[PDB]
Amino acid sequence: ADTAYMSNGVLSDTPPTYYAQADGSITTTEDAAAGKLVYKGSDGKLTTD
């Protein structure tokens, strides 16, 4: 039923949703007031650290 998705370390019913902002930044949620804009480095997977 293509509804089981593999998250970073667990299984979730929703895919990893990445939202792109107008200023070239990428955030987890629509509002830039939240989100903890995603980073990358030394391991890939675009973890928010």
Added chain:
Amino acid sequence: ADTAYMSNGVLSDTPPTYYAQADGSITTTEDAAAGKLVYKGSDGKLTTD
């Protein structure tokens, strides 16, 4: 239509959505990974600063 609600400084269609975690923290998104844990103080309105 009860679909226009006043946010901090802008009129938006959604209510201010605040999520409560098990550990007592209050976050703006479901996942603890993002959210920018909310705060209160010196003016109310529960600003995220």
